[PDB]
Amino acid sequence: LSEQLKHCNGILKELLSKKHAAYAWPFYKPVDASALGVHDYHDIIKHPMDLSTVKRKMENRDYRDAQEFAADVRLMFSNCYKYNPPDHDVVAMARKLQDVFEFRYAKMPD
Ligand SMILES: C=CC[C@@H](C(=O)NCC)[C@@H]1N=C(c2ccc(Cl)cc2)c2cc(OC)ccc2-n2c(C)nnc21
C-alpha cells in the first residue's frame, strides 16, 4: 500500500474495533433487504456498501488511492441517510460513526 492507504487501513481497523461497536455494528455486513423486510431498498439504493466489502477490497489491494477508499465509506453512510428518516436510530448511529471516520481521515499524511 501507498503511505496514504496505510492510514486508510488504520482507520478501517478502528471502525471495526470494540471501542466503536455499540454504534458501528449495523454497518458490519451488507444490508439483507429480504431479512429486514425492506422490499423497496434496491429500488432506492443503486450501489450498496458496507464495512466488510471495504475490508475485502482493501485486502485484495483494490483501492487505487485514498480518495477511492473515502468515496466507498462515504457511500455507505449516504445510503443510510438516503433510505431512512432523519430521526431514525440507525441514522444517529451512522452520524456518530461518521464523526469518528471524518476526524481521523482529516489527519492524513503528505
Ligand atoms: C436497510 C434497512 C433500513 C433500516 C430498518 O431496518 N428499518 C427502517 C424502516 C435499517 N436499520 C437498521 C437498524 C435499526 C435500529 C437500530 Cl437501534 C440499529 C440498526 C439496520 C440493521 C441491521 O442489522 C443487521 C443491518 C442494517 C441496518 N440498516 C442500515 C445499515 N440502514 N438502515 C438500516
Numbering used by the authors: 346 to 455
From the paper:
In previous work we have explored the potential for establishing a bump-&-hole system targeting the bromodomains of the BET (bromo and extra-terminal) protein family. These four human proteins – BRD2, BRD3, BRD4 and BRDT – each contain two tandem bromodomains that bind acetylated lysine residues in histone tails, leading to the recruitment of multi-protein complexes to chromatin. This process has been limited by the pan-selective nature of the BET inhibitors, as they typically target all BET bromodomains with similar potency, hence specific proteins/bromodomains cannot be associated to specific phenotypes. Through structural analysis of the bromodomain we hypothesized that a leucine/valine substitution (L/V) would be a more conservative change than the previous L/A substitution, resulting in a smaller ‘hole’ but still allowing enough space to accommodate a bumped ligand.
We therefore decided to replace the methyl-ester side-group first with an amide, as in I-BET762, which would lock the side-group in place through a hydrogen bond from the amide NH to the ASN140 residue. Methyl, ethyl and allyl bumps, the 9′ methoxy group and the ethyl-amide side-group typically met our criteria.
